[PDB]
């Protein structure tokens, strides 16, 4: 069963795989994040509560005063969104905190206070988020882009055998915290362990172990295994553990229990080890030579003399063994070291390390961290203890602790955010294990090692920074001065916090203007995963390892949507179904597969857990239960594809389009395109300009309706009902009775947005798409936005294309356009500009907005009213005066000849200088709106008073109308109540409505209905009055402009650019091209019915570029328009409804085993006619991205019309009338119109304004600048013999101050000759060198 917005024009669907998970709300990222930020969180872990609990309470300098936090409350904004955009202010809400101040007493370290005081203190305004995920920061809509940064935790990277001659691999750990110093542990080519805190100078790695209060014996105990020795009256019998015997050759007669097991010279075999274990051998006898290199393990002191025989970690030799023989020691502990399994890394590091105990290690860390100042006993301890183990200056915090515990294979996933001795020891142990051979390194691009920040997290961090600066200020104020029974308002300042948060939201690498020239462009800007920004890798210092597409992007980040150019692969876009874990990592749906059945329960798997399982492919056949119809299914298990069994599978993909993003899932036949061309198409599909009459995609994907509705452009109904009055600017839905709350009398009022400008100067304007008295259900679309159509995203028009070379007018990539495309006004777009004229307060006097401008005639001033401001609706052109403004002038010291001229003609120069705002050259529009802002000390002119009166009348009429609709509904509901339980079929309509609210009722729940409705009516009655007074105050009051500006006038032109050679067009498959001609109608190729083609593309664009998508789209569009033309023919003569039913059913039953049964016998014989009317321009067709419509189905559809199966007809020539040989492809392709308009690119300059220090022209087209004759062009001119052109190109044209004017005079005298001189930039260079000590001069 279909919704009433889908029984109008229902898109034929060609997909075969039944979907099981509907597309999630596309903007969940921004909305969920900022909802987590501004939210009462009782167990404060995220939100403003986390910041307040983290930085509060603030304790004075032992002054027995603490400032402690209680709660907070977001106020409500003074201006809503529309008024914030009109007036030019941020959209924010005042944050108000309840703070409590205590003053303790004496003889009471924790004793009770002597006085408390709680006060609600205002601290800052945080900008709220609109319903669509965009902030309004200064009148404009900003979008904060998510970030993809490396997750906090421990990462055991490697070196991959570089940076050394021998090609050794140098492993190294790193401990990245969320806030605080780094801590590495790198090897060196001698296998000594080294630590470098904060990426500083290197140190031997046992320095930090000694700093953690470990002696040498404890270090050797932690990192090694003791090999005991014994002295059994001779022969040095040694305790044995059988496993350790591997990897060595027997250097002596290995015997025990009176039996020789392995002899000298023979290596130890694994079976020999098994024999030793089986024989149960504990103690053997080894020669004294075996201790020639065995490192001792603990200190030994001769008990006779009390002297240190041998310090720990010192190689035993024959002399030492003889010395400690008679010493009375029979136990000797050594270290078990091998060359492949237990290396002696820590022992060698101890030998290199020049420290001896805790104090010297702390001094060594101090000299490394803070060189120059002399270390002290307490300063070194405080530095080391505040480095890592202090909560004020080190946090991991929670994702960091989870990654840390999991990477060392620990049971728990939550702990202290600061380090500890065991954490550092375990990192060192794991690194040593990785060196030994067991374990693998962590690749730092695995999408399980890269988090995603969002707006909530970044705004929370910035607010925390604001809080800590206020904390320092408070703790300064709390200690000094007095006790004093002050209040916790004078102690706090609200400018630092508001400054910090506003500086984040308004100026950052991640807070950028929302490009707003589509629904698709907005909805793909809000879903961006940037890698740049604060705390992320810069563009210059990112290699090729992170620019690349990883096997973990499958279902999390799109592979074919990334901006080519300087940052390709740093600005990834989120996939369709991809979500965000609790911690921040990305995850994607999968279907749980039981024994053999593909269940339809959905599990989201992050990037790590996806590795363990085996996951089938999206397009795997299954029959009515879920059993895979094959015995082998193409799965992917360990990051690599492979063919597995039917029973080993564990999960199956949830849809065939879950890999590609939302921009690249709107391209039909993507599986036929290339990858570079698909990238270009996905990037050019979001620059399309909303045209005048947005049309439809004739070949779509089914992802259009979701993008249109989920983006905020359209006006989706909230509760179902019946349209009561639809206007060009208002829709009034009357809610169904069952969806109505007991109190209200529901009638929703939707106010449409009419002709406002977007950020890219285009126009956004909603038109209602519902008739009058037409039922609507919940979630229907009531107003097509910019570039949508009945709820389906439509970015451009579909026009009859033909693939043939046409006399060279489509040579390289150009396009030859018919003239019907400009006669029908289908690519004609509307652009809206804003021009401002500020009236400042100069030193010689204020400027004015008068209409009496000096020395200008009368035709220019004919379009200005009495107050010097242009009318509304006045068709201005380039150069006309919009706002007449004159500034005061000095004396100007006029030349003698002009003095004589004035003396002759008696004319007197005026004392004011004309500086009026005038239309920029080139544009020619209609003025649609004028806004006047006046500072609150200036007498408003007549036009500002007229605008105020219009605004006030409009507001009063609006509120009266609101109360009229609502009162009509309220009394309708009251009358409907009066029909049952107190029926008055004729006793009611006679008396006036003012007494309908005061009648009787019976003892039911219906008793408390008339009273409720009456009281709601009274509430609305007073609410109208209060809203009216509020609006009148907000209108009649003055503005608050910049300091020193009296009034601002803003004029909105509405240009309308059509089409011309130069304008860039493109399809969806990345086939761009500049329009090259506008051919007359009678010169285009025509088939045997006389219909010309509208666009003639080039064949040779297809084979070299391999975007075969466009040709299949052309064939399918031809089939769709053939169905449309057949329906139109059946509808032109009024045949019947049965014939229409039969044909449309046959058109909807193609092809081979599709979904979406569309049985038309349930349509009511009148909804068939509306459907046929909406299909008379061509039946829309849906081709899901990788599910596709096969070529055989396109042939069958072409046969269902009458078009030729081959897809190619025979076209005749326009001018000669004789047919082209070799039949050519025609069909309807869907073409966009990118906003690289020619009349924004074209520029020319003869002479304008020159720069300040180096007298050279300025930059392009906004300051009337000249083109840059750079270095490569100078080499090109030197390669010729062109020495005179070069000399004029860098002295007279550009830089030489006298040559410019002399050349201009010589040109206007008809004498082409130059007198070059010397450039001014060279004199600037001479002064800037000579201003060092370097004397440079020009000697002849």
């Amino acid at each position: 069963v279909y919704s009433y917005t889908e029984k109008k024009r229902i898109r034929k669907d060609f997909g075969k795989r039944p979907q099981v998970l509907d597309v999630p709300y596309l903007l969940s990222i921004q909305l969920d994040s900022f909802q987590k930020f501004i939210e009462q969180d009782p167990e404060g872990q995220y939100g403003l509560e986390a910041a307040f609990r983290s930085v509060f309470p603030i304790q004075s300098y032992s002054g027995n005063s603490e400032l402690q936090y209680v709660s907070y409350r977001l106020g409500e904004p003074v201006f809503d969104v529309q008024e914030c955009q009109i007036r030019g202010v941020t959209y924010s809400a005042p944050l108000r905190v309840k703070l409590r101040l205590v003053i303790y007493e004496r003889e009471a370290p924790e004793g009770t206070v002597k006085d408390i005081k709680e006060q609600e203190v205002y601290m800052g305004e945080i900008p709220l988020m609109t319903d669509n995920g965009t902030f309004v920061i200064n009148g404009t809509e900003r979008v904060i882009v998510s970030q993809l940064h490396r997750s906090p935790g421990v990462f055991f990277d490697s070196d991959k055998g570089k940076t050394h001659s021998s090609g050794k691999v140098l492993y190294n750990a790193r401990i990245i915290p969320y806030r605080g110093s780094w801590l590495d542990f790198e090897f060196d080519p001698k296998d000594n362990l080294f630590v470098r805190i904060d990426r500083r100078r290197k140190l031997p790695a046992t320095i930090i172990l000694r700093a953690l209060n470990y002696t040498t014996e404890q270090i050797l105990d932690l990192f090694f295994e003791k090999v005991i020795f014994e002295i059994r009256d001779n022969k040095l019998q040694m305790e044995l553990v059988p496993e350790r015997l591997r990897g060595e050759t027997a250097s002596f007669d290995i015997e025990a229990n009176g039996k020789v097991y392995v002899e000298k010279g023979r290596r130890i075999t694994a079976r020999h080890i098994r024999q030793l274990e089986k024989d149960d051998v504990k103690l053997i006898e080894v020669p004294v030579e075996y201790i020639a290199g065995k490192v001792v393990a603990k200190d030994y002191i001769d008990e006779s003399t009390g002297e240190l025989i041998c310090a720990a970690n010192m190689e035993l030799s024959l002399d030492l063994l003889a010395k400690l023989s008679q010493s009375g020691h029979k136990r000797i502990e050594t270290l078990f070291t091998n060359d492949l399994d237990h290396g002696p890394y820590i022992s060698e590091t101890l030998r290199v390390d020049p420290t001896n105990d805790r104090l010297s290690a702390l001094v060594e860390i101090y000299r490394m961290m803070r060189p120059g100042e002399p270390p002290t006993r307490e300063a070194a301890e405080s530095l080391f203890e505040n480095l890592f183990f202090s909560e004020d200056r080190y946090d991991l915090s929670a994702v960091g602790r989870m990654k840390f515990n999991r990477s060392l294979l620990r049971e728990e996933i939550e702990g202290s955010g600061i380090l500890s001795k065991d954490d550092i020891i375990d990192v060192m142990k794991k690194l040593i294990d990785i060196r030994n051979g067991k374990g693998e390194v962590d690749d730092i691009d695995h999408l399980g090692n890269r988090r995603i920040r969002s707006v909530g997290e970044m705004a929370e961090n910035q607010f925390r920074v604001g809080l800590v600066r206020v904390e320092r200020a408070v703790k300064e104020r709390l200690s000094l001065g007095d006790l004093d029974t002050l209040m916790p308002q004078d102690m706090i300042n609200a400018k630092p916090i508001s400054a910090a948060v506003k500086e984040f939201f308004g100026s950052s690498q991640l807070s950028q203007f929302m490009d707003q020239n589509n629904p698709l462009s907005e909805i793909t800007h809000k879903r961006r995963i940037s890698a740049l920004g604060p705390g992320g890798l810069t563009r210059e210092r990112a290699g090729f390892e992170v620019r690349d597409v990883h096997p973990t992007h499958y279902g999390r980040v799109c592979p074919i949507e990334t901006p080519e150019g300087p940052n390709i692969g740093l600005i990834n876009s989120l996939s369709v179904y991809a979500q965000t874990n609790e911690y921040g990592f990305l995850e994607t749906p999968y279907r749980k597969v039981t024994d053999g059945v593909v269940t339809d329960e959905i599990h989201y798997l992050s990037a790590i857990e996806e590795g363990n399982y085996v996951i089938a492919q999206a397009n795997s056949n299954l029959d009515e239960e879920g059993h895979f119809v094959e015995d082998l299914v193409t799965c992917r298990s360990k990051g690599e594809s492979s063919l597995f069994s039917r029973d080993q599978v564990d999960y199956m993909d949830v849809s065939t389009q879950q890999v590609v993003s939302v921009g690249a899932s709107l391209i039909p036949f993507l599986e036929h395109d290339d990858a570079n061309r698909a990238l270009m198409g996905a990037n050019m599909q979001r620059q399309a300009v909303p045209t005048l009459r947005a049309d439809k995609p004739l070949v779509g994907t089914g992802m259009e309706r979701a993008v249109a509705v989920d983006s905020g452009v359209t006006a989706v109904a909230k509760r179902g009902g019946v349209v009561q009055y639809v206007d060009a600017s208002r829709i009034v839905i009357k809610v169904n009775e069952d969806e109505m709350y007991p109190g209200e009398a529901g009638i929703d009022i939707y106010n449409l947005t009419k002709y406002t400008r977007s950020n890219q100067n285009t126009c956004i304007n909603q038109m209602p798409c519902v008739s009058l008295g037409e039922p609507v259900e919940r979630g229907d679309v009531l107003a097509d936005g910019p570039s949508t159509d009945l709820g389906e995203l439509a970015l451009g028009q579909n026009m009859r294309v033909a693939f043939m070379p046409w006399n060279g007018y489509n040579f390289e990539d150009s396009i030859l356009v018919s003239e019907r495309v400009v006669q029908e006004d289908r690519f004609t777009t509307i652009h809206i500009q804003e021009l401002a004229c500020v009236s400042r307060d100069t030193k010689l006097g204020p400027e004015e907005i008068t209409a009496d401008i000096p020395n200008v005639g009368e035709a220019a001033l004919s379009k200005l009213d009495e107050s010097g401001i242009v009318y509304i609706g006045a068709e201005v052109t380039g150069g006309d005066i919009l706002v007449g403004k004159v500034t005061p002038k000095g004396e100007t010291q006029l030349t003698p000849e002009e003095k004589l001229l004035r003396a002759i003609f008696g004319e007197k120069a005026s004392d004011v200088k004309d500086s009026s705002l005038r239309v920029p050259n080139g544009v020619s529009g209609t003025v649609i709106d004028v806004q006047v802002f006046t500072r609150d000390g200036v007498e408003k002119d007549k036009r500002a008073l007229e605008i105020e009166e219009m605004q006030l009348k409009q507001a009063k009429k609006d509120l009266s109308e609101e109360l009229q609709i609502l009162e009509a509904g309220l009394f309708s509901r009251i009358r409907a109540v009066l029909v049952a339980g107190g029926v008055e079929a004729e006793k009611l309509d006679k008396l006036p409505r003012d007494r309908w609210l005061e009648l009787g009722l019976t003892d039911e729940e219906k008793q408390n209905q008339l009273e409720q409705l009456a009281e709601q009516y009274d509430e609305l009655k007073h609410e109208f009055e209060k809203k009216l007074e509020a609006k009148r105050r907000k209108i009649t009051q003055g503005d608050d402009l910049a300091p020193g500006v009296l009034k601002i006038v803003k004029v909105y032109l509405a240009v309308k650019r059509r089409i011309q050679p130069g304008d860039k067009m493109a399809g969806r498959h990345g086939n761009k091209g500049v329009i090259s001609k506008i051919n007359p109608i009678e010169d285009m190729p025509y088939d045997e019915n006389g219909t010309p083609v509208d666009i003639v593309l080039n064949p040779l664009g297809v084979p070299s570029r391999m975007n075969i998508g466009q040709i299949l789209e052309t064939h399918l569009g031809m089939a769709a328009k053939g169905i449309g033309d057949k329906i139109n023919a059946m509808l032109k003569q009024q045949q019947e409804v049965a014939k229409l039913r039969e044909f449309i059913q046959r058109a909807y039953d193609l092809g081979a085993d599709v979904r979406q049964k569309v049985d038309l016998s349930t349509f009511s014989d009148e909804e068939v006619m509306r459907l046929a009317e909406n299909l008379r321009k061509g039946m829309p067709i849906a081709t899901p991205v990788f599910d596709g419509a096969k070529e055989a189905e396109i042939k069958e559809l072409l046969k269902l019309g009458d078009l030729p199966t081959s897809g190619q007809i025979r076209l005749y020539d326009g001018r000669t009338g004789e047919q082209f040989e070799r039949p050519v492809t025609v069909g309807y392709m869907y073409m966009l119109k990118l906003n690289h308009l020619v009349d924004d690119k074209m520029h020319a300059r003869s002479t304008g304004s020159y720069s300040l220090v180096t007298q050279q022209p300025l930059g392009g087209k906004a300051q009337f600048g000249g083109q840059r004759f750079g270095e490569m062009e100078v080499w090109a001119l030197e390669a010729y013999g062109a020495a005179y052109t070069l000399q004029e190109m860098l002295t007279v044209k550009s830089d030489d101050v006298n040559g410019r004017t002399k050349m201009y005079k010589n040109i206007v005298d008809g004498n082409h000759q130059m007198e070059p001189g010397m450039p001014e930039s060279f004199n600037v260079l001479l002064k800037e060198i000579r201003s060092l000590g370097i004397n440079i001069e020009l000697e002849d």
Binding site: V363, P371, G372, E373, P374, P375, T376, R377
Partner: peptide
């Protein structure tokens, strides 16, 4: 306390003044 002259291992013309 512990001292090995320290001149000069650092720039920082305020650290020199404090020393």
């Amino acid at each position: 306390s512990s001292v090995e002259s320290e001149i000069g291992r650092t720039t920082d013309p305020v650290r020199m003044y404090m020393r």
